[model samples]
Target: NDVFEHAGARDVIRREDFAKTGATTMREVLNRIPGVSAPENNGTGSHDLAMNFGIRGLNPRLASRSTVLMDGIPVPFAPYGQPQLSLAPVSLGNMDAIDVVRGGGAVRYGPQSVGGVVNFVTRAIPQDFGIEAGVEGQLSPTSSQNNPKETHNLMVGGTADNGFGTALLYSGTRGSDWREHSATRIDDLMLKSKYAPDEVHTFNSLLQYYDGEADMPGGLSRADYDADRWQSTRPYDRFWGRRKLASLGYQFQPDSQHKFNIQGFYTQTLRSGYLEQGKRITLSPRNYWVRGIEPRYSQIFMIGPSAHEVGVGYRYLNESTHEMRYYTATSSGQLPSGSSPYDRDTRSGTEAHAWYLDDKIDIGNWTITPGMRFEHIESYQNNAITGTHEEVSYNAPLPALNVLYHLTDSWNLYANTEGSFGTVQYSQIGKAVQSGNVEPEKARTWELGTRYDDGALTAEMGLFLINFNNQYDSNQTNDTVTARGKTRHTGLETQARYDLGTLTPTLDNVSIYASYAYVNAEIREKGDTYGNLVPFSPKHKGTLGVDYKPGNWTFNLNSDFQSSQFADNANTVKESADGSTGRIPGFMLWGARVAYDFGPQMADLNLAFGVKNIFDQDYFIRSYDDNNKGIYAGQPRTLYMQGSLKF
Candidate 1:
């Protein structure tokens, strides 16, 4: 009775009751979904599983990419892609609920939201006092340091009958790193609070922070990134990172039929690191500090029992960066960093504002919604050392239309069509030209689907397609130029859940569920040989699992499946030295977890554990972009156990 959102958003988690354990980075977890594989880079296992959401014959970063939000906010990173799943805190088990919103959110959010959206719903403060403490870890073949990866989660407090509530959560882990050559360490903290005065208004807020570092596996010639057994002995490049976030929100409901919401968020991201080229080359690398604010106002009203919604939002981001270390060595085979010249101060700023309106009308058994969004943006950059200035400004209007028909309360059919138009991340022509920005990129999408909902069982099916133009990497061209990026995606996705409660022979206090998906993505109209077949996206993906909770014991088992996909664009072994020019094979993994709780409260102890890669199978995750020389291999089997205490 609590499933909320689109199709194929979430199924079952084999780890925690409120969390799903799909691998985000490395070929480890994401590929576990059946009929999906990112493929190996350059045909080598080195850069396997570099990106997230490589499913159903498409690139992992296609259209929206995967976006993960905590309590409705973005925690960005993943140099490989957005929503950086691999880098997400290991303590997600502490979340209250999760929503997987599939397909095109660009209509409401921004780019990188293309692949889809994964939203974590934190538990609201309770009217009573509460605290939960637990420990978890990844047990495997071990790292070079022989330290198995491990993590701990701590949560406390509740919302009193008063108007205020607070929650504090901390998560951290220490261990041998990935199969790559680096020590892995992580720490994060999140504070959530809410205020409700009277019954007509409410306020909510969140504060989150994370810091960590890792060894970088260099991208080889014709390869994006690579690492070997030999390189594991020493670290080459490393990244030290930190993210700080805070947001304030307000909600108003004048009556039962009207709703209003507004929020402002502040985010500061700091990245400091050094890059080493091969063994002999090196660069001081760049340190980028960004400060941004996002403010939004949305309203939903009922006109004749139909929904009419509108929203206006604004985003402002200021970035300051430095990339020169005089004392450091340069790739010129020189002993001095930027011995020639250094980039002293590279500063940039961007601002964007958008307004959207949507209306849903019901005529007989049909409900139709059409919406439009207009966005205006501006950007400016100044290089103090070079006395150079860049400025740009532009605007775009996007449109969306959806129609749904109710074939009884148990069945619904719908079709959605949407288009995305933007000039650039920057605002003006001069902003992009001076900032070395390229032309703007654009996309269009179409989807047709149906919904089957019967109280406990909700099933959805969709056939979708997308097209892209003028895409860039890090930046697009060598001359810092811009060109149109082209891509076409089309496919079918079918998801179902046969809740044990809905089955004819229902099991008492037990729920069983399963799902499957398929997608086809391709890159077209390109200047390079990067065309032909879209790479990295898995052709098929499926999940099967069982959940049982009888008395104090709860058990879960989940197996993810994937289909083969090309790791790189150069799908032929003939063109690359790595002999990985073409596609890589697909593989699967299994996970299981069990937990026992004395009760929700008045419990002395609760125990839980998880096993990943039950088979200890070794394989690579897939990719599309070239240059990664295969820095990773899937994990060997591992086991863990957790015991919790509560009063």
Candidate 2:
């Protein structure tokens, strides 16, 4: 219902939606959304340590095209200089909801918005003292190893009479994937507090720590994959990461018409990965320190018969990165025990200032919003190996407009156009130093959509177009990075959910949900690859599901579908000997779940049993990255059981 009020395309996934899908990873939950795809990486399955997905037809690697946040705070390793999620810290067990804003967000969010913004909302403190404990376990019976995966979630929270609330949350995962040497362990802990001394003043704080380690089973060559896809060739490959974060926020609202809010956050992250390259094993470790502050003010007023709300916000961000790499000979499929000389050492820093202003005007049954944003960024890099220092600075001005018309109480039409910008990252800058300097990526996006929301049925459909310039592409084979001239992405997205119970009393417990996306993304620049479809941009993706609830029993069935996509800009159809360059065949996966809930008489206990990839579909995703290039198998049919108790 709230989504209908927005002037742009937006979608919200609640806990129940993803929970019922028996999703063990965030990627599974994200695939349920239209125009978004999160494919399996490195055949990691439940051991996914990094999130790789994208919005519309953008590249899904590292989710670089979009801005991902948690509770309004940036979740990437570095918000400014390194936006890629090489070490994704968020876990699925702590998430309560997911909000995706596909359009009309340029003025408020920055750096990368060509795709959109994804915010992971965590569970909140309960008004009354509450405790919850839950566990989920998965087993792949068809796998040769028959490894089992498990996750645990615990939450305790309450609010006092004096308006002070606090919550402690812990979620951990210890598991192994279907393939051998694919073990993983993750621990996430958080403390959240809120104090509302009076009606006009409020304060909130969050302290969190995350640690994760996963063994990379490594990719399989074409011949090796055909022989045994589950075999691990690079047993020494692994990734480790840790993050510590703290944030404080204050809000002042003297009255309903005027409000002021300020938030500040600091985070430190360390990520290290070991990869086996032929006879040598390379270990790359990087550390990031980031801090930022944002202050916002809003006011609402009426002029004659029209009402207007104006908002002004500013953000300041500072980040630094220290990276080092080491190489040693691989011995007996294990890392060498002795220390090795450092092969590379580099440091980078970024300082950014962003300001935004927007005004929303409402007259009769129409609403319009116009906004602008300005960004000033300064970045510098130092290479110890080369004894050289480099500096780069840039500025961008973005603008956006949104319009909405209410046709009826339950139906509305909306349109939006926005401009977005993305600066070169530290890795890209390193490449630029060797190759040539590249300009920042910029894009103009437009969307037109209509939404209908009734008690029984909710639906939304939209048409989107993006004119992107200075697109960047990294050629892993050639070890070079280049920026293309221009690219265009035109697509259609739609999603709908209906409850049959509204039509008749007999069908009151049945509901159906569906989503579909069709995108045609291609290079518009005049070159050899002109008019070629972008890599990993599937033309069609869709989801269909149904839920049936009778009394205390619930049943769910769903299927996900994806069309064929190329692995490179050349749109190569035949497979290379290495299995890294080829067309990825389409796939359809089915999942089903059944749950039983016991009333308070049983301490509010609930149990669920489900199967993912129920049909045991065989699918593979190809990667062309320099470090991880080869074929990765998707998850096979697996059975899982989940149980929870509340007090």
Candidate 3:
């Protein structure tokens, strides 16, 4: 009953699915899910995990509308204050399952559940004294100008009979970066433990530490990009970060009808960099601290012939941030009190409390679910140099309802509507506090969908509509003049997979899979930006793939396409003189992978080979195609080989 299942569009990819493709990042693993896009870069490890990802044509900036989790725990630098990918380094090498819910049934998760939730579930300990280990490496194409980078990881886990189990994971990446004078290094370690003393009591603990170092090659202008796409103009832009997090959880279940779950976590992230700003270098250092707890109680009861499941939960979050920026000395790139003069120095804090209630009623073949959430938020910022302080507070009430009908054992119909809200970022809070005007972003979403699943075929289709009001739009040209307006997003998501092996004896292990989404995302407010397509939103996104498996060999191929869209609110199809933004071109990308398993002589070994952008296509994953043209070229004809061992 604790497992999450929504009636609308959702997808689950197991370790077998990822193992076939030799997937290393979320982008590679999640490409088949409709309406989700996350681009990949050439840098290994951290860079592989670095990308602004979004769903249903929503703005991809910081993935602000989405809620991401690791083993059901929010892993952002500051859950509600700052959700940065650097702080959420999803481990593709160790994850066992990926669950994504595209519809709005995610009201149980607070803050940014409007866009949806993407959860990475880790592997569980085996039963009765067990040990397993594995390692993998990736090598870039030798023909490309980009240098090769590699990442390797070692993982081991075991379980004891005395109701105890533990695992340790360590990974490292080091090599030449994609640019000159730039080298990257990333390292991470994690320890996990679980204890089940009896049928009614259980405890889980997690400790993680990460450190990343990379030369920050800032975005480039058209002129600089035309000179050399692989050149690093900011050799002094040293970006580095360190993170530490620890969490403990307890679950109590005295009977199958009643259960309670409680958890607490503390995390801190620190980062510093010297970045180039035209003729001068700017030194910035930032730190974030987050601590929170959640407790919930659920009951399963019966009323006559109808069964009911009810849950109530409370969550508390405390977040604090400190940021400093200064102009560094030309010779040493050091601040002046130490050598540089301060430009901006500020501190920010956020406190949030929330209560949520949900009930599920199942009668006959129909299930009706309803939920509500009430949240209170307080935010503040202080200027260290000016001795000025500002604060703001908000209250939000969100509601949702869902209906599911089972037409048969294999087919189902469902509909849902929900309301959600997002808090301002910690950096944005600092600016909004100074201006003394703050409005929380709010959204209302409606979805209708159906699903069908049999032994050999699975299909899902959904229609969704969303209205976002008082949304904050951080301007690309100017930050002081932020815009808050209304926007709308509507789309159709469809996906299907069929196994031919069951229908035709000659087809053996052959299957076809495809998914597509048609989205109309536009600004609804009156002004120069009214009626324009949302920046970075394409009208159509789709993918088609085929998988073949026979005996001990497996083969796979897939292609993805995106329609053209604008890079700015004005929706310029082309760049204007003295402008820094314009249209983004549509593109098609293709990839293939093959794998083989060893025979009885080495049954524990598996090997795979994969190639991305097989045609050596030249394209840009991000850019206005105007001022910022060609800064980030999409992955081009990259090849990698992987091997795994099991015991």
Candidate 4:
């Protein structure tokens, strides 16, 4: 409701929204938001272990275009060196909200913000003692085996009289996708604590462990997909990963005029994958360690007739990675062992320091904020296979400006422009070491928007433009990389929700919501494919939904639509034989849910039944990343049941 006051485009998805929408995965919920495209990684069968999404028509693979955070802390294996989430550690069950800041975020977060910032907020400790447990099951009727997927969640927390609070959360998922040999398992455990020794100071800490394993069913060729989309040809393909994280935070606020905050975090990740190629087995394993600290201070003061809130922040981060690849002969019922010569080995590290300052000036009905950020980054790469070592360093200065005008109590207009910077990843560093043609990425983004919110109606509309430079693309099939000189993404995003109760009492429990985005993303560089649409960028995408809540009964119906898109930069109009490069046909999916609340009865129990892909629509997402290059079928019609109890 308070979004009208923000000087930039922002969206929040609350816990209640998740339940109402019957969203079993983060991707489902994200599709309802404008300017976002979150498609499933079907071939990997990683389920929720991986998150693939992008903002404003940027690349959605590995979520590399944006800065993803968990409770304000970077969630990627290496925030500065490897900003990809091939192994996302977050679990949907443990999150209370998701906040996306699409514009005016460069002053606080850096290294990668061409898309924007995505923050996953965890559930907090309850004021009183509480315990909640929930279980959900999903079954796909269209699958050959008709297997059922299960997810479990448990949370226990409470606050003491001394202002101390603690919470323990566990969420796990075990399931098989619609395809054969697509089994997946994920476990996430976390402990959170907060202490307030006095009114002026507060401290918080977090410890978490996550483990995941999935069978990669392998993508299918065009002919194979046309015959049987659920068949698996590569049974030996698999992925495994684990992550450990620790974080500490402190805050000091003596009064409303001044505030200070400091936070430190450390994360370690282990990941490995197996793939079969040319009658042989290839194994790739990687490890990453990252540590970071952030400090911020803010003060409010008066400048003549204007009220100013000035903020300063700094971040220091260090990350290291070890990557290796090995090949072994493939035999019947045999896997790769440690007795093979390594084909590739690499080590990389990145150290970065960033500082930013911003001041918000409020004068009468107008608010203007200007900010700047400076970043210094050093990266080192060592290739053991080739006996090569290299170090690179660079500095970047980012500036941003935001303006907001309050038209009425319920209306506001805003505009913002910012510069963003991105560094080369560890994998990219190795590629650059061999080719020496890769460079860091940079972009300028601007947005103009308006927001409106009242008791029964809320809406937002925005126009955005992104001028991207040094766009990068890697072709695994040809073992080559290319850096395009320029690209442009321009689009319009709008969303609205209205409650019928405001107009008539007869329809007190009915509401409707909708969102749409029209994007024109194209390559601007001088090349054979100049002016071609960017891969995975649909020209039109939208969602429509209706919700009803009367007494203890709740009902929801929603649908999402996406237009056709190309799978490769060439924008091939016809499907290739390999199914890796072609046009992805448009698709639409419908879902419905019915839920009932037991109002303090049976320990405050709630039960929900939902159906996704109600018509069993057939769709496929194409990918050419690494060794998994082909078409992967989307989810079939699925039925799910969930129950939760609180004490």
Please identify model 2 stretches exceeding 4 Å from their true place. Answer: 43-47, 331-338, 430-436, 475-479, 482-484, 503-506, 600-602
Error of model 1, residue 501, in angstroms: 8.6
- Compared with the true structure, the alpha-carbon lDDT of candidate 1 equals 0.54
Clashes of 1: 58
lDDT string, candidate 4, 192-232, tens digits = 99999889999999999999998877788989988888887
- Give candidate 3's error at residue 53 in angstroms: 0.8
**Which segments of model 3 are wrong by more than 4 Å?**
1-5, 40-51, 129-146, 176-182, 329-339, 430-438, 475-481, 576-580, 600-603, 623-630
**Candidate 2 lDDT over residue span 364-470, tens digit each:** 99999999999999998898899988888999999999999998999999999999988877767755532256657889999999999887898889999999886
| lDDT, candidate 2, at 300 | 99
lDDT of each: 0.54, 0.84, 0.71, 0.85
Clashes per model (N, Cα, C within 3 A): 58, 1, 4, 0
lDDT per residue for candidate 3 within 1-647, as digits (tens), equals: 11224655677788767755556556677766787765443211124334466787776655567888878777677777666564345566556788877774566787887778888877666555444444445544533235566666666777777788887766666655444544667777778889998779999998888787776444455576556655655466566777788889999999999999999988888876565444456766789888989999999999999999998999998999898877755476543334568777898889999889999989999888888988899988887988888787888899988888888888888899888878866656545532245457789889998888887988878899988875564542233425536789899988888998888888868999888989898889677778888877888888888999888888998888888877667777775432236566788888898888897255367788888778877765443321112355455577777776666
Comparison by TM-score, 3 against 4, better one: 4
Candidate 1 C-alpha lDDT tens digits along 147-259: 56566767787877778889887766565534444455567688888899878799998887877765544333224324343133224445556667778888887776566
Candidate 4 lDDT (Cα, 0 to 1)? 0.85
Give, for candidate 2, the lowest lDDT window spanning 10 residues: 39-48
